[PDB]
Amino acid sequence: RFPAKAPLL
Amino acid sequence: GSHSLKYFHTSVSRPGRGEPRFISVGYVDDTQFVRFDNDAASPRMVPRAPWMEQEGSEYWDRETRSARDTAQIFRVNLRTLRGYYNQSEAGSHTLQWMHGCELGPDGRFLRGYEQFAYDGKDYLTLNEDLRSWTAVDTAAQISEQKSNDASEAEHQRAYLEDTCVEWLHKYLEKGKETLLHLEPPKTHVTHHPISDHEATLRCWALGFYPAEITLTWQQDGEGHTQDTELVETRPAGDGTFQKWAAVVVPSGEEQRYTCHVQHEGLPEPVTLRW
Amino acid sequence: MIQRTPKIQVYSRHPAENGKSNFLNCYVSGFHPSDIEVDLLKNGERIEKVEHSDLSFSKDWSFYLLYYTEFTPTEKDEYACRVNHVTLSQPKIVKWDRDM
Ligand SMILES: [Zn+2]
Ligand SMILES: [Zn+2]
Ligand SMILES: [Zn+2]
């Protein structure tokens, strides 16, 4: 399942 | 057997052309099952394995929304990183993200992964404890500090330990006859003379799944060393893999050389001569 | 800005047999950046409906792609792969050998 978000870099 | 759910994300900037190109693929072990490519009018998550084309539209709508938002986050990140590195907006840059969870033989969570890469090099890596980061430079240390202030590693850990494990079990159930199926390699040796006194013995391993395999050439006796040419494991295009290993032997001395193949689909290793 | 040169394998899905249908594969891997030009050649000429896998990458962040087309090997047809990339000083051409 694709993550809901990705970390902000 | 152990299993893993992994996703691989790629974002490439297009200077002067608007939105960056985003491509994302998901794998269960060595089986790709989903893909998202934002190069379309309204791009959607689509199935890339037969056992995934029975899923309801609620799943695909949810994955399409998640993939679209991550694409937007990567658009911000590409801009942020070219700020850190003082790079012009005319150059193309790549941001890659891979994450995943791995189950042990008991079916329980064992390990999680997450890593970021900018322009092909490591950038930010989540450590084995899933609690700390490892930065490769001052620019990635700002990224690490932002994540630490927002407890981001706790958010990624929760996804890796809970969401990823729960859905990996679901995927392993829907594709039970294929994902849990081991495909043994089909093996044979070929003979190709280099000169009057030398020849090549090429040991083939064809049509196996998963891709993990070991090919070695052995010679009768002990203390021997073989200079083995070994090709990278390659996809057959049907879901299985191929590999071969070659060794140069003197002519007439072929029968004293032996190929040994190890694979999870082999109850015992197989042995081959020519 | 690391740049990696592509590794190339040209091979068939099944062991070749003249007059019998098969699949010709060009496997390209270990390259960075992602953009790459891969063409399958039949007797020097470009085949026009070639399908390729979806972009993925290895543990070292380098990309890999499979390019494939249905084909029927013969004793007289020579097949090859033409690959060009930013890391290459000239396009690389690899001939299909049914023994590799
Ligand atoms: Zn968060
Ligand atoms: Zn089978
Ligand atoms: Zn000689």
Author numbering:
A (entry chain P): 1 to 9
B (entry chain A): 1 to 274
C (entry chain B): 1 to 100
Paper's wording?
HLA-E exhibits preferential binding to a highly conserved set of nonameric signal (VL9) peptides derived from the leader sequence of HLA-A, B, C or G molecules. VL9 peptide-bound HLA-E complexes engage the natural killer (NK) cell inhibitory receptor, CD94-NKG2A, thereby protecting healthy cells from NK cell-mediated lysis.
Reflections from multiple isomorphous Mtb44*P2-Phe crystals were merged and integrated by Xia2, producing a dataset to 2.7 Å in the P1 space group. Perhaps unsurprisingly, considering its depth and hydrophobicity, P2 Leu to Gln or Phe substitutions were tolerated by the B pocket with minimal repositioning of the pocket-forming residues. Additionally, P6 and 7 of the Mtb44P2-Phe variant sit 0.9 and 0.8 Å deeper in their respective C and E pockets, in turn reducing the height of the P5 kink and increasing the P5 buried area 40% relative to Mtb44 and Mtb44*P2-Gln. The hierarchy of tolerated residues is consistent with our structural data, with P2-Phe up-regulating surface expression of HLA-E to the greatest degree. However, these minor readjustments in peptide positioning due to P2 substitution do not disrupt immune recognition: CD8+ T cells isolated from the spleens of BCG-vaccinated RM mounted responses of similar magnitude when stimulated with Mtb44*P2-Phe, Mtb44*P2-Gln or the index Mtb44 epitope, emphasising the similarity in positioning of solvent exposed side chains and thus their antigenicity in vivo. Notably, Mamu-E restricted Mtb44-specific CD8+ T cell responses in BCG-vaccinated macaques were preserved when the animals were challenged with mutant peptides harbouring Phe or Gln at P2. This supports the possibility of enhancing MHC-epitope complex stability via primary anchor optimisation of certain HLA-E-restricted epitopes in immunogen design without disrupting TCR recognition.
